[PDB]
Amino acid sequence: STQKSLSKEEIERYSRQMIVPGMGKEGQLRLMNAKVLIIGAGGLGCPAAQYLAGAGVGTIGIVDGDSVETSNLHRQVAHATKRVGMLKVDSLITHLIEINPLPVYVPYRFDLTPQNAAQIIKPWDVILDCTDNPATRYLISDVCVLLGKPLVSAASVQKSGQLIVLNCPPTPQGVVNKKAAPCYRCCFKKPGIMGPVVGMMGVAQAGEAIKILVSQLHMPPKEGEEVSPEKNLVQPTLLIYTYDLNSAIGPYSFRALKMGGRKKDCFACGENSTLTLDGIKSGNPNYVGNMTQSTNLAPEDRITATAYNEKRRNGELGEHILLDTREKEHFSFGSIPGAVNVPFSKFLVKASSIKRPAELLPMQPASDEAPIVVVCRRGQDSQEVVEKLKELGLDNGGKRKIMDIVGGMKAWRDEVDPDFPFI
Amino acid sequence: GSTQKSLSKEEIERYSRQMIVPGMGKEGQLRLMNAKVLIIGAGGLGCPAAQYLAGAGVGTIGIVDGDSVETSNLHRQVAHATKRVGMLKVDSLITHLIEINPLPVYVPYRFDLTPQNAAQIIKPWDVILDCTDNPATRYLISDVCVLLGKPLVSAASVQKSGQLIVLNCPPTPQGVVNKKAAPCYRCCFKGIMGPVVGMMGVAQAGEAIKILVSQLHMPPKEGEEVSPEKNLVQPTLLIYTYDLNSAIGPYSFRALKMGGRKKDCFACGENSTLTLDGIKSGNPNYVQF
Ligand SMILES: [Zn+2]
Ligand SMILES: [Zn+2]
């Protein structure tokens, strides 16, 4: 059943998408063999579906029981004025077929409920929560945890919208002996609209779904290895798009907050969880605004060249250590004043040699709260440095921040010191 | 077209959900309906921008494009249809906009924008959106916007990323450098995935709506400065980086603050020799970059 080759028609339609680095024929076949479920055919669901249909997701399921109304067309741009009164799912698929008739579209002409949630979700690979409903959002996350599904959730309100990837790669309920991605309860313990806001989050949802399928981000890591922290999966990002009608794009229009992993005491995914699929069906979790404050924001792991310089000029980073991990001869061409050179090549060997005293890799420290900042050539290996330093308990249980500079010394040149001698 | 002082019964129902947003209301809606927004380019950037300006009720929407719909671009140009392959992009896009909302007036320009016609196309419009995704054309549009006093919302695809910036808003006449003024595109500078270009396009519409509703393109009170919190005189360069092997991260979005108008800018700076006559005659020359 799995499709392994491309036809002449598919090569034409997808040619300009396959040349994107990291896509190719393999990435395209992964999309065409994938099954994505979209719950909600409105403000979030329309843009999400448009771009998943165009990209060539093989099977697209759409769940919605409401109908097209004139008052919602301003934000539901996949519907037509001529199709007012039609079921949203029927209206949306009509437009998706126009974009791309090759995918198989599966309508669910009813709303998701605790009684049918598991039945609807089980066959699908990636789940997109395009409901703007809190109750349904908690229900979907619960089911995705119990059924082992990755979830891309979005929400919108008057002035802001949000997006987050949850339970990806999925980890069974109750597992707390390893690093695991959070669920929606881990992140948010229970307490008009502008088109661009909901449209933004919807397009971003499709973007994440495409990434997950093409790169197989929902597949487990190699036995004994943890997911790369650089993939932003086990500690996903909470994207928040703030839309203020009286201010153009600002520094905090797009805010990305790093979340913690699975909570050990989470009602749904934590240990000693009482949540079950039959309990949901029986109404045991009673799924009583649309966006609420998070409850597991994690300590920051990175800093921009701009922000690091801004703090250095104002003397804010007191007592801190600055580690330059470029190789010796590269460090000799110039560096940030005050940077100590600890080449990455030797660093990995010395770290390999601590499988026996304590922490000789590093240099003279002060207090237990003294931040460490890592910088490399262009920010490709510095996250791995930070990750192993934390693996050896040199963050002192979280009291000591360990960060790297985004973009390395290249970003330093581009953002702060254009005349820096970069190699 | 720009003289509406009332909303009809159909418009009240169609726009009820967005008027109730704080800062919009009836005054905000009439400002959209009395506005004229030009969209240069009917492709990956232009389709999402047009869709959301149409739904929101911008009274007059112009679209400039001379190319045709192709099958290999549908993955990113989602306002087009497979059965409309071979049709002009401008006509195929307006077909879908009319579906979304038939109340606005749509003005197609069925031909390429060029140095010989840029001023003719741009002059009648209030806010300009550059959706060309062509570096050379970007400089042409910026230049003309500076000379004709227009606010410009420009977006682009670059490598594995997208970009967006609001320029010359509120517009300031060429050569004025004795006050704070917004930059032009020169002041700032010298295979694509659908969601990338789609997100920038939606962002472009969100900015055009901001400008018209809050009148961000109007001058400040005499002797008063433009509030820096509006991010206009020193705008932000939004950069969204999209990597297929990494979920959205904390710095996939970079907001770089730009400087104001440069005193020595070739186009908007002091002693500028750029003119509308020159642009028409090939001076400067917009070399393909
Ligand atoms: Zn949880
Ligand atoms: Zn300039």
Numbering used by the authors:
A (entry chain A): 3 to 193, 206 to 302, 306 to 373, 378 to 444
B (entry chain B): 2 to 191, 206 to 304
What does the paper say about this structure?
In eukaryotes, the ubiquitin‐related modifier 1 (Urm1) pathway is responsible for the synthesis of 2‐thiolated wobble uridine (U34). Uba4 is a two‐domain protein containing an adenylation domain (AD) and a rhodanese‐like domain (RHD), which are both essential for the dual function of Uba4 in sulfur transfer and ubiquitin‐like conjugation (Furukawa et al, 2000; Huang et al, 2008; Schmitz et al, 2008; Leidel et al, 2009; Noma et al, 2009). Uba4 activates the C‐terminus of Urm1 via an ATP‐dependent adenylation step, receives mobilized sulfur from the Nfs1/Tum1‐relay system by its RHD, and subsequently forms thiocarboxylated Urm1 (Urm1‐COSH; Leidel et al, 2009; Noma et al, 2009). We heterologously expressed and purified Uba4 from Chaetomium thermophilum (CtUba4), a thermophilic fungus harboring highly stable proteins, well‐suited for X‐ray crystallography and other in vitro approaches (Bock et al, 2014).
Interestingly, the structure reveals a homo‐dimeric complex of two protein units with an asymmetric positioning of the ADs and RHDs, which themselves form individual dimers. While the ADs and RHDs individually form C2‐symmetrical dimers, the structure is asymmetric since the two 2‐fold axes do not coincide. The individual ADs are formed by a continuous sheet of eight β‐strands surrounded by eight α‐helices and are highly similar to both MoeB, the prokaryotic ancestor of Uba4, and to ADs of UBL E1 enzymes (Cappadocia & Lima, 2018; Lake et al, 2001; Olsen et al, 2010). Like the AD, the RHD forms a dimer mediated by hydrogen bonds between active‐site loop residues Arg398, Arg399, and Glu405 occluding the active cysteines, which suggests that the RHDs are inhibited in the apo form of Uba4. Noteworthy, the RHD dimer mainly interacts with only one AD. One Uba4 dimer harbors two nucleotide‐binding sites, formed by conserved residues of both ADs (Gly45, Arg77, Lys90, Asp134 of one subunit and Arg18 of the second subunit) implying that AD homodimerization is essential for the adenylation of Urm1. Although Uba4 was crystallized in the absence of nucleotides, the highly conserved binding pocket enabled us to model an AMP molecule into the structure with high confidence. However, the function of this linker is undefined. We found that in one of the two Uba4 molecules, almost the entire linker adopts a stable conformation with a well‐defined electron density, while this is not the case for the second Uba4 molecule in the dimer. The structured linker closely interacts with the AD, and its residues, in particular Asn307 and Met308, are in close proximity to the ATP‐binding pocket, coinciding with the expected localization of the C‐terminus of Urm1 when bound to Uba4.
